[PDB]
Amino acid sequence: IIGGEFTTIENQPWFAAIYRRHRGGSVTYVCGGSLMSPCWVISATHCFIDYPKKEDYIVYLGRSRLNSNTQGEMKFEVENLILHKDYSADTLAHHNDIALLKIRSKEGRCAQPSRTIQTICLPSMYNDPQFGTSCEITGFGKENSTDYLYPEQLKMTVVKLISHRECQQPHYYGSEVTTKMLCAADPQWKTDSCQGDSGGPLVCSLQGRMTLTGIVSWGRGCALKDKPGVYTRVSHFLPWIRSHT
Ligand SMILES: CC[C@H]1CNCc2ccc(NC(=O)c3ccc4cc(C(=N)N)ccc4c3)cc21
């Protein structure tokens, strides 16, 4: 997250920190995720397509810092990694960038809700928020494009949804952004999500209910002028989410 403010997991109870074990034992942060139900986390397929082995992944909930055990957290492994079978990736845009991870603790249990571990509701058929609505994002991604390290503390920011016809204009993304995607950004272009935040939640207050409207997918640079962040439109994939869970 570029700009924005630091925060703690108690503010983002459904955020999931997804790590991966390397050869030798070293472990590095990969992508973010959102808790759908006690046993399920939804993220982005491009975060796993290169190393499709469910065994190498570690998932944390109620964890507020990159390298510190936060009072109340729960460590998990992945019982099942399901990737969207029709996924692909062009020069900038990503398609059907959605994934499901069925989690399980060493004792064989799913997540146990607490003050710092909660689920977020999915959207309903054809009912997305109008353009211009403010929504928030959270992640452990770069604070600046030039950094090579990720911020030690969790961060979040607020951006505004952008209409599809506006996101398809020449100086934006043209025909590269389809109807299955949503754009969002900062009007002054000072804050935005960035590499390291992929797979994370785009939550919107819709009709009085916090709703997982998007999943961080792609974008040209970070916080660049006329270059919004692009997110997977969850509402479109409801049938897929239902059938695979
Ligand atoms: C080596 C990394 C790699 C693995 N193979 C597929 C793949 C594929 C992709 C990404 N994602 C990004 O690197 C990335 C970069 C910039 C971003 C900018 C925004 C934004 N402007 N809000 C949103 C998401 C981003 C993701 C990473 C990787």
Swiss-Prot record:
Domain Peptidase S1, residue spans: 1-245
Active site: 46 (charge relay system), 97 (charge relay system), 198 (charge relay system)
Disulfide-bond pairs as recorded: 31-47, 39-110, 135-204, 167-183, 194-222
Residues modified to Phosphoserine: 145
Residues annotated as glycosylated: 144
Record gene name: PLAU
UniProt source species: Homo sapiens (Human)
Name of the protein this chain belongs to: Urokinase-type plasminogen activator chain B
